[PDB]
């Protein structure tokens, strides 16, 4: 599995900052998710940064903004360099122990996974490689990325290091971003327009990536979404103004350790149960990955699980058919899975991808 280092450029570390990654000539962060930040504020890394002065962290503008809203990562401020999207950027790497100098060009491509999420395309003197980070690309999106191409064909890519979360034929198709959004929108609309006392709880994981759902709901329905904390979007106006810390709203995305018990007793995680002593009428909506097989057809993005509860199709990652389409299009020499799906093995995932690769 992926532990920070690509074979072709081992002196850079991406989305992993412990163990062998402590000797990196440069760091890269694809997106601000805990699973891709292992060791990023460890004492040993800080120790190492005090020694090595020409070591930087590179990421997208949004990732820089998000990361540094957390006090615990503020020590990175002096060493963090953002790179604009789809803007090829020369990066110089120097050996601390040896004398060595090394030059690479990096291009950030949007990953469709959460605010600030990118893929990193690296070009240097040891071939071109693509690190996808976490991604969801719909069909046709890769073909529109001009900087994946050279002279009207895809660039010669030696190796792709890719998000294989749903790389198993069972996860053949997943409804699109737009389909998922429209389903949730119409469910919420149909509830909250009944009266001011009808409210929705969006039961979401504690992670970036639900913001486009919140913004669309807010934009379409003229309501702000209750969240526990929104200071990370202080400088992000197109997100911030769709959120609120006030409990007096019809759409909630607040969180609590016992939030599901609270919902079973008609509460809501933030504790509001009534207004003018009228009980709030609450439905829960849990964004959840849903998929259909190769020989099946799409069914409703909304799944009712109780009188007052729903699951709603939502995915942070590409389907199997999207992964195969992406890799087929890239046609690299090698493809390496970043992640093994829960019910599969590395050998099955590698062999799924192998026919789409040149060696
Ligand atoms: Ni992620
Ligand atoms: Zn709330």
Author numbering: 3 to 361
Provide the publication's sentences verbatim:
Artemis (SNM1C/DCLRE1C) is an endonuclease that plays a key role in development of B- and T-lymphocytes and in dsDNA break repair by non-homologous end-joining (NHEJ).
We crystallized three forms of truncated Artemis (aa 1–361) with substitutions in several of these metal ion co-ordinating residues, i.e. D37A, H33A, and the Omenn Syndrome patient mutation H35D. The overall architecture of the three variants is almost identical to WT Artemis. By contrast, all three variants retained the Zn ion in the zinc finger-like motif of the β-CASP domain. Thus, whilst our results support the importance of having both metals for the nuclease activity by Artemis, subtle features can influence MBL fold enzyme activity.
